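Our collaborator T.R. sent over the components below with a one-line note: 'Predict the complex.' Nothing else. No constraints on interfaces, no templates requested, no preferences about which chain binds where. So this is a plain run: every listed entity goes in together, and whatever single assembly comes back becomes the starting point for the next discussion.
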Amino acid sequence: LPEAYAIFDPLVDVLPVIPVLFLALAFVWQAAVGF
Amino acid sequence: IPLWIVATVAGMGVIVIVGLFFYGAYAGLGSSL
Amino acid sequence: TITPSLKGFFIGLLSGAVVLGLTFAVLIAISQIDKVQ
Amino acid sequence: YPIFTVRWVAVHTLAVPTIFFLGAIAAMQFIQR
Amino acid sequence: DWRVLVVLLPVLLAAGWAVRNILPYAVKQVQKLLQ
Amino acid sequence: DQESSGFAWWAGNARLINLSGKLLGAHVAHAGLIVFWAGAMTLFELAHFIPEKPMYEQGLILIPHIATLGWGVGPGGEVVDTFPFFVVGVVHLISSAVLGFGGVYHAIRGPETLEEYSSFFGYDWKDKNKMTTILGFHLIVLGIGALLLVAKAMFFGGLYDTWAPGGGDVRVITNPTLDPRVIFGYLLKSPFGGEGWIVSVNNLEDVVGGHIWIGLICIAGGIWHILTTPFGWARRAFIWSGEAYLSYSLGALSMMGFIATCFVWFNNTVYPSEFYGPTGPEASQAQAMTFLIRDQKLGANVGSAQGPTGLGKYLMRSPTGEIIFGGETMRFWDFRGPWLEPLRGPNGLDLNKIKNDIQPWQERRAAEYMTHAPLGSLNSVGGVATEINSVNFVSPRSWLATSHFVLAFFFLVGHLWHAGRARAAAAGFEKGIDRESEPVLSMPSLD
Amino acid sequence: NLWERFCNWVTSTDNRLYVGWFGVIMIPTLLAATICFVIAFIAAPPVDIDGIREPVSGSLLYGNNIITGAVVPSSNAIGLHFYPIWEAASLDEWLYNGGPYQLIIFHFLLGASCYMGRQWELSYRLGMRPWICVAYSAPLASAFAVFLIYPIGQGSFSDGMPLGISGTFNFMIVFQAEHNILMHPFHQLGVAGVFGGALFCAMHGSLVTSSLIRETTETESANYGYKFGQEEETYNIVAAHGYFGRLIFQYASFNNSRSLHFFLAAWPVVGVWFTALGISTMAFNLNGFNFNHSVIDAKGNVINTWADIINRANLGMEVMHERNAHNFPLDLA
Amino acid sequence: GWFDILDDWLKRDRFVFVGWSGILLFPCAYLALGGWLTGTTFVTSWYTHGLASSYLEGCNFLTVAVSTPANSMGHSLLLLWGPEAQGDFTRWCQLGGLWTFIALHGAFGLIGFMLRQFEIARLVGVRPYNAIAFSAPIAVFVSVFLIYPLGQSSWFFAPSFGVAAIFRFLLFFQGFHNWTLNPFHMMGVAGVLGGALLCAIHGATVENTLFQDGEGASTFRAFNPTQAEETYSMVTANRFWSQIFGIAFSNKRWLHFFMLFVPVTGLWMSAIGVVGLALNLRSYDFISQEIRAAEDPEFETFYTKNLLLNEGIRAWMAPQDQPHENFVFPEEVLPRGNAL
Amino acid sequence: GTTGERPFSDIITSVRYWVIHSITIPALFIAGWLFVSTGLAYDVFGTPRPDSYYAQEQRSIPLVTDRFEAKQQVETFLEQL
Amino acid sequence: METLKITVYIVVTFFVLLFVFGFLSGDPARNPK
Ligand code: CLA
Ligand code: CLA
Ligand code: CLA
Ligand code: CLA
Ligand code: CLA
Ligand SMILES: CCCCCCCCCCCCCCCC(=O)OC[C@H](COP(=O)(O)OC[C@@H](O)CO)OC(=O)CCCCCCCCCCCCCCC
Ligand SMILES: CC1=C(/C=C/C(C)=C/C=C/C(C)=C/C=C/C=C(C)/C=C/C=C(C)/C=C/C2=C(C)CCCC2(C)C)C(C)(C)CCC1
Ligand SMILES: CC1=C(/C=C/C(C)=C/C=C/C(C)=C/C=C/C=C(C)/C=C/C=C(C)/C=C/C2=C(C)CCCC2(C)C)C(C)(C)CCC1
Ligand SMILES: CC1=C(/C=C/C(C)=C/C=C/C(C)=C/C=C/C=C(C)/C=C/C=C(C)/C=C/C2=C(C)CCCC2(C)C)C(C)(C)CCC1
Ligand SMILES: [Cl-]
Ligand SMILES: [Cl-]
Ligand SMILES: [Fe+3]
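Returned assembly:
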């Protein structure tokens, strides 16, 4: 990463897993509506 | 306390603790290093 | 005479007899308090 | 509802040591040779 | 040795703490049983 | 709720089948996830990238795609500036937010059905005209996208070309192959060994050319489907429903996924070994080369050296006579790569060129590719299974080949699933057998 | 019309065996593979599977019994090349190089793929729900894995599973030496699938036999209490669930027959799917977990585990498989 | 009477039924499972095998084992109060005492569980075929963990309780007994795999021959456990398999008994053959083949190739798998082909 | 039907439960931690520490050779450390 | 050899054409309801 963005290089380590969480949230939601 | 909250936090506790076990597999005892 | 292993044998015998005794003692007691109708 | 039952004992002889063991296994990840 | 009391301490505290939060609700259970 | 539609929570997206506004929403929302992963994964790869190491020693699959398109790299694949990687990730990531915003809006806020909101976006699955029209638009989009690759190769910097003289480099593609006997000759080769079907495309001209062709084929078919309705023979040969079309694409996505597997496993043109690590056949051939060079330097006569089995130790013939590398690599003699083709004469490997013309950069390349063979354990220990820990490496090729075979296999299962159900829903027994009209109870007995 | 009569018979439900359009491919291809397998098992001459001119005998007439006999895979010199009869100068050359293997496996894979489609097809003609063929996809995928997919990734049909009892074991052993498939979680899920399937099959059968409703005397079979096509269920699901729910606890039991039968399908099929996928992805040398020398002491001495004992055994298979075929020190083919 | 009072309490309808069989089952099962969990977390194998085997030492879930006692203990019961440990909990663990503890408490647990199936079956009103079928798991456990090491020199050559340890056991049995060649194991394969097949195919058949008893597209709701009618069509499932495969079930009772028979029969056959391997009474060879191959060096089958592999396994793994033998193989005796 | 205990649903939902168990579950967990962090688990079970598998100049594995004096043989091994 | 190759090519073509043309000759309509 260009050093002007080096401040986010911790945030980059997490970003690719965000789509997975979307799968998990659909279960939180169906749990909250009682399936 | 709504169960769906209890379900999410328990699993979240599960995911954290499993992640700690996989983490240790690359560091310290049993890491090959 | 009583060799070390024969002493151990009684150690085990009494241990098991204590375990089964406490077991059946407690099980009979519970059964007397919480009977059926 | 009663509070302590045969089930109560059964869940606690499995669960008490499980959490205890997960704790011990947790700390093991930080052992360095 | 000292390590044993270090380890048992939380469990003792937890048990006592649970004993104190459950005690009124247990002595009624036993009282209900004695019939 | 399941009482309203029939479908249960675990089959909840089937409640979207006749709600075009929400269905549009999920689709646009899903496309954002793809674009999100693409951008996010790129920045992760760039945050972990080391220019002094080859890309394949670092677990990278996206930066290799970007570099093959000619962005970021110089001669022989060396990374010279990383800012084009950065852009590709940021732009995808920023775009995903747009795709997400619209997807969520259509999902929970927009109108559930489109058919009363607009007669142009609305669609009924059983309406064969509107479906071919939507198909036509998307065919047009696909054609444009395939031409964007042409344009990048011909007008906008070119492509990385592992075959370029002097060693691979970025190169502008001036003369794409348009000869239909070549372009569609690939589509007619055998899938089997030494042939390769479309996987054998080994020059950028043939790649760029084929894309000009499907680019044109698609736009034409798009126009054709916008203007026509399905003929009568197609009407009675197909099932016209949303699930039916979903199954048709699962079969296709499956076929494509298998093909993708073979491409990244065998092909080192559109998957430059400079970026992806050697192929399986390549690393084995590279091993034989490395030991040929070493033993010959010691004084061995690699043409007449007999091996334990009686076959040649360094050199034997193929079943059609060609001089090939010996040993168990005999199976890999269809391999072709730029580090080895200089030693290839018309009859195969040329013993004179082996003796006098091997260059240091070849010995370096063979050794590098021998010790980076796509072999490794699930936890990325490099080598055969019996290898001790030390080398952290699995080839991107293994990672890409294995994942897409899994995805392909499961999408074939998906095709079988939704196809049969589509057929049963249309016929009216996808929910089970009517007790009062059981079909078998009215057929005669087999005996 | 004459073509419509043909089509009416191809698709008839009154045929003792259903033919169908999938069957128009299935019947000839299976018959070809079956006839050639029978003949080669009995009579084939030795085949040079490892392409090192050391032929391997596999047929009965050449000194094999039912256990040691195989149709031997085609030569390593052939690799992935297509090798029908007409590509060979003579039947003699074809037999020497492994021709019947390709003929058989390609006809069989085609025939079994159409067997799967035949299952969808007759089910559609009968008014059935359609997914039985999805279950059969799990063994079909497994067959695809070991006859086709694993040769592709390795680069030769000579690493295909031999068509023979001992040949199969030679496949499993060399596979474990090369890929450590016991330590691969996809084979472990396959074990969990076939063991679990065996268990659940055992369970369901004992639980239903247990709940059979008395309809017979003692001097006859309990089976004669069921008549083909009665509308009454023959066992008592409530009693069976009453039993099994007490065996464990009630919520660990099934009270819905459809939910239980779905579980019976899903557990082995999924697990076999994964184990097909394990062969199919080890084909591209993504291998099982490697823990060799993973545990170390403070000085740096290796402290073996059971993984390192598995490695010593893997090593001994490794240096003995294809004992003459390697001229270079890495096993890359 | 106090016996009839204790019977009243043991047979109470609770969440977890106890019964008379519970007095045996629960403490033994809980102690078998607790002993495995205890050892895989804390207990080494450095003095019995020279192996690490606990979470505390660095092992993961696939490599932890409660390992067998050293060969020198023979078939010692290895009781805590016995002569080897002499009541020292620490030394008992270091000597392999958890292995016999688990195996023995486990063996008795399995007796308790089978008695449990009997006890519940009689109280509930069903025939006891579930307990009959559980004979096959017991027969397997007894032959592999008790008889097989009793046949051999010690508990050492029993399976150690662990995932990778079990895999080594599998590989030992190929290299040493040529277990794949044994027809009693082959019959087990055919009953395990044939059981998987029957499980998959019967579940699919029922799910794909259901009657339409609801209007929902998820078809599970259309069953009530108290209903009297079959939920799927035996007639239709019969015609289908008749025309697809040639033969089809026509009797639901025979079909479900057959699902009991097959995997139960097969596990019992594999036990029998393991009993043979206790005595090294292997199906290791075919004498006819060895006579041909010794006189004809151009004879080569897959059978003769497997034996080369078995010989490689034995020489390459024995020095560390059998460390009480003080084996030292100089490199030149190791069998190996060219290059590798 | 229902056997008679309080449903687990109502229990992990009720406030009294999590009053009690937000202390007990962490207590045992911390207890387990301290069992390993104090080094007690090493001595209770006799499992070697990373510096107690060999002596500083030894690659021979301390294998138990004798059945009946085995307890003493293990302790003669620990002394050579 | 070549006579065999031509013989099998004809055979294969024949059956493949039975398959495509059979499944185009109105398959969905061939069902019980
Ligand atoms: C890729 C995954 C995906 C997607 C895109 C969808 C999308 C959809 N599902 Mg499906 N679903 C999925 C997975 C998915 N589903 C899975 C895995 C399951 C199994 C658990 C289900 C189970 C399921 C059921 C049971 C149902 C749906 C339904 C729906 C639709 C309405 C949902 C609703 O009412 O939400 C309401 C929920 C909320 C309002 C909570 C908030 C949700 C949003 C989307 C959070 C977005 C967060 C994001 C970061 C914001 C971005 C902001 C932007 C500026 C960038 C919707 C089109 C429903 C349907 O068909 O109705 C007719 C329905 O009944 N789904
Ligand atoms: C096709 C997709 C694909 C491929 C080929 C790769 C390949 C790679 N990734 Mg990437 N990755 C992907 C998707 C992919 N990734 C996705 C979707 C995410 C988001 C979570 C990421 C996030 C990610 C990160 C954060 C990292 C990688 C890294 C890597 C490397 C190491 C992989 C590894 O060790 O995995 C470990 C293996 C596994 C976890 C095994 C998973 C097995 C799956 C779950 C089987 C699923 C089967 C089936 C689909 C289930 C349904 C069955 C049902 C229907 C019956 C490797 C080069 C690493 C790297 O080196 O970066 C530089 C790294 O740090 N990836
Ligand atoms: C496939 C995507 C798609 C589709 C089919 C639709 C369809 C529809 N949207 Mg939706 N929408 C989408 C994406 C989509 N939207 C996205 C991504 C966003 C977020 C930016 C929105 C935000 C949005 C809003 C806020 C609203 C709609 C509304 C509408 C309706 C009216 C649109 C109209 O008249 O446009 C007429 C045509 C135009 C305005 C010109 C569009 C020019 C495009 C954008 C040029 C770029 C084309 C290029 C190929 C894009 C590449 C994308 C990249 C990822 C490859 C219609 C049903 C309206 C509605 O239903 O209200 C009730 C409404 O209020 N949409
Ligand atoms: C995404 C792409 C796509 C899709 C989904 C469709 C879909 C459709 N097209 Mg369109 N079409 C497309 C692209 C597409 N088309 C393009 C790009 C063109 C321009 C070339 C055409 C030209 C075209 C024409 C000329 C016609 C259609 C028609 C149709 C309909 C019937 C298709 C059919 O019967 O196929 C089934 C395929 C066959 C029956 C072919 C016979 C079997 C072949 C030989 C199988 C070979 C497969 C095998 C595995 C080999 C593959 C690899 C390689 C060797 C080829 C259908 C609605 C028909 C219609 O009704 O239009 C109004 C019609 O006449 N399309
Ligand atoms: C296709 C491959 C295949 C198949 C299907 C089989 C099938 C079988 N093999 Mg064979 N095997 C194979 C390949 C195969 N093998 C190969 C290639 C080798 C190498 C030569 C071996 C080596 C091998 C060995 C060494 C053994 C087998 C045995 C078996 C049988 C094991 C049956 C079983 O369930 O035991 C499982 C064990 C039990 C059922 C015992 C009871 C267990 C209780 C009920 C468990 C309860 C657990 C409790 C509730 C708590 C658990 C908690 C915990 C998980 C946390 C079975 C017949 C075994 C045998 O024949 O035994 C007689 C045996 O010892 N195989
Ligand atoms: C949705 C996720 C799908 C996952 C893959 C498919 C799983 C089931 C496939 C078995 C096919 C068996 C042969 C015929 C079996 C058959 O005939 O099924 C019949 C049964 C009932 O069918 P219905 O007609 O009622 O429902 C299907 C549609 O009609 C929707 O109503 O189908 C289902 O219940 C599907 C359940 C979907 C939900 C599946 C989730 C389970 C997998 C979870 C992930 C496990 C991962 C393990 C990792 C180690
Ligand atoms: C429908 C639905 C669903 C789904 C949803 C979705 C799928 C959504 C999506 C969403 C999305 C798809 C989103 C996205 C977003 C994105 C974003 C938000 C981004 C942002 C970015 C940025 C801001 C950037 C930044 C930067 C730069 C500029 C440079 C470099 C560094 C950084 C990174 C810092 C679910 C399943 C839940 C269920 C319910 C219903
Ligand atoms: C780009 C490129 C290229 C090219 C490509 C191309 C040119 C392609 C084409 C392609 C094509 C041209 C394709 C096509 C395909 C086809 C298909 C895939 C088909 C399908 C079919 C179907 C699916 C059918 C079915 C059926 C039957 C069989 C019977 C009746 C019924 C039905 C209809 C169902 C090249 C290689 C040069 C190079 C690289 C780049
Ligand atoms: C030995 C012995 C004994 C006993 C003891 C006991 C009884 C113990 C118990 C113990 C226990 C009782 C423990 C527990 C543990 C547990 C654990 C350690 C767990 C873990 C878990 C996990 C880790 C999970 C995982 C998973 C799964 C599996 C599912 C999903 C996925 C996951 C990953 C989440 C006595 C002293 C009496 C005597 C002497 C000897
Ligand atoms: Cl071999
Ligand atoms: Cl070699
Ligand atoms: Fe059944």
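Summary for T.R.: Chain G has ten helices and three strands.
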